[PDB]
Write a protein that binds this ligand. Structure first.
Ligand SMILES: Nc1ncnc2c1ncn2[C@@H]1O[C@H](COP(=O)(O)OP(=O)(O)NP(=O)(O)O)[C@@H](O)[C@H]1O
Ligand SMILES: Nc1ncnc2c1ncn2[C@@H]1O[C@H](COP(=O)(O)OP(=O)(O)NP(=O)(O)O)[C@@H](O)[C@H]1O
Ligand SMILES: Nc1ncnc2c1ncn2[C@@H]1O[C@H](COP(=O)(O)OP(=O)(O)NP(=O)(O)O)[C@@H](O)[C@H]1O
Ligand SMILES: Nc1ncnc2c1ncn2[C@@H]1O[C@H](COP(=O)(O)OP(=O)(O)O)[C@@H](O)[C@H]1O
Ligand SMILES: Nc1ncnc2c1ncn2[C@@H]1O[C@H](COP(=O)(O)OP(=O)(O)O)[C@@H](O)[C@H]1O
Ligand SMILES: Nc1ncnc2c1ncn2[C@@H]1O[C@H](COP(=O)(O)OP(=O)(O)O)[C@@H](O)[C@H]1O
Ligand SMILES: Nc1ncnc2[nH]cnc12
Lengths: 71, 65, 67, 67, 69, 67
């Protein structure tokens, strides 16, 4: 329940398995696509182009299917 | 010091919570896990919620410390 | 940054002063400060809900408070 | 090194101010006290305003600016 | 570029030159004036009275005319 | 860390790629990235302007960047 011991494995699994996600922004806008990569502050989401979403503007990330969770 | 043992308890006892977001949206479910920056909330699929986007975590029944 | 914040919150906590917490989205929560740390405040009423400080705009006691 | 002396000037001279919050709310009163994260705004009661919720501090009259 | 290596010079230039700016806040509100001074966390915006603006509440700083670093 | 944000922004800059920058309040800005630091981006064209990153939600390149 500490560090990034949750967020990183999670995003990585989404990326590795190319799971389609919805990313809801803090203003309620919804983005959809696949996680191409990410770092400590941003997530790169694919579709028409690969856009760079700032984590500070994201509220939730909702995978289109259940997925392995971090250990 | 308060946040962790608190979230810990909600997770452990599997108490259904309402998570209200900074824009007013209400999310509902059970807390599977959480780390320093995010909380994993469980329903149909488990979704990842950034804490910076949360205003309040409201348990649907009272708990202790 | 907790040289005014902490004693202020602790005073509200020890004396159980009824307070309103207003959120950045305008939701007004009412109750009392059960407890707090560096990042959240635990506000009591029906249940005790955990409030993220980053989401708070103001804390408004129902009555004036010493310090 | 600028924020501090400014706020302190508003405090010492008891200048009436409007504080606009990031959501557009306008609070009025005077700066009673402050630390790194919050401002104690006095009027009906003295409430605690988190600095992160604030967009601007606007004095009702021109005031000495920090040199 | 690292750190404040763009923000400080850019602001410090708008300051020195007394260029009229529009400052948009995260809520869509537009302030206008001249940058009197600034530090790590706030900008003092000068007009009828100077006002102290928290950088955290600002989205964009738009000069009234082109400026050169 | 910045192992992605920085090379991404620098590639946009060096290659003069047109971007649309969407702010947290839903307003969309367009132009080329002239410069950037850890905290702000300088956007240029029909109007030159300094953008705080904390107020940005997405940077959408008008064509794909290749690391
Ligand atoms: N100190 C505050 N912090 C954040 N929001 C406030 C505050 N005071 C008032 N508001 C909001 O702005 C609205 C207008 O307030 P107002 O009509 O002047 O009455 P008030 O005594 O200042 N607060 P209230 O007792 O809740 O009505 C209120 O209804 C609140 O929603
Ligand atoms: N030493 C300081 N001097 C002046 N302002 C500060 C200082 N430290 C933090 N702040 C402000 O207070 C906020 C930082 O507190 P923080 O614990 O990060 O909550 P927050 O994330 O800013 N709340 P929010 O922006 O609504 O998500 C920022 O807005 C800062 O601008
Ligand atoms: N210095 C400021 N900082 C943040 N918001 C402001 C500021 N000045 C005005 N506003 C906002 O702008 C709107 C109203 O301002 P405006 O129409 O320009 O005149 P006014 O503020 O109503 N005049 P007054 O309130 O009597 O000083 C409100 O939404 C305010 O929140
Ligand atoms: N998991 C979520 N995270 C953030 N916002 C959400 C989430 N689910 C729904 N919303 C928002 O809640 C609001 C209500 O719409 P809603 O009826 O829930 O749509 P839907 O049923 O397709 O999810 C919408 O604005 C939507 O963006
Ligand atoms: N360069 C900019 N930076 C940030 N916000 C902007 C910018 N230009 C326009 N806006 C915002 O767009 C919003 C739309 O308001 P509006 O009444 O249509 O005037 P305008 O079309 O000039 O923007 C405004 O609230 C303003 O905040
Ligand atoms: N890639 C994005 N990142 C952040 N916000 C976006 C993005 N794309 C669209 N939006 C938001 O969605 C809203 C409108 O969506 P959009 O369909 O693109 O507009 P339009 O209907 O004019 O084509 C805008 O207010 C904008 O803020
Ligand atoms: N954010 C919120 N919105 C509505 N009711 C609430 N009760 C506790 N927190 C709440």
């Amino acid at each position: 329940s500490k560090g990034h011991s949750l967020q990183d494995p999670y995003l990585n699994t989404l990326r590795k398995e190319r799971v389609p996600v919805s990313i809801y922004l803090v203003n309620g806008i919804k983005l959809q696509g696949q996680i191409e990569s990410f770092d400590q502050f941003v997530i790169l989401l694919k579709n028409t182009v690969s856009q760079m979403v700032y984590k500070h503007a994201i509220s939730t990330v909702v995978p289109s299917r259940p997925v392995r969770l971090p250990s």
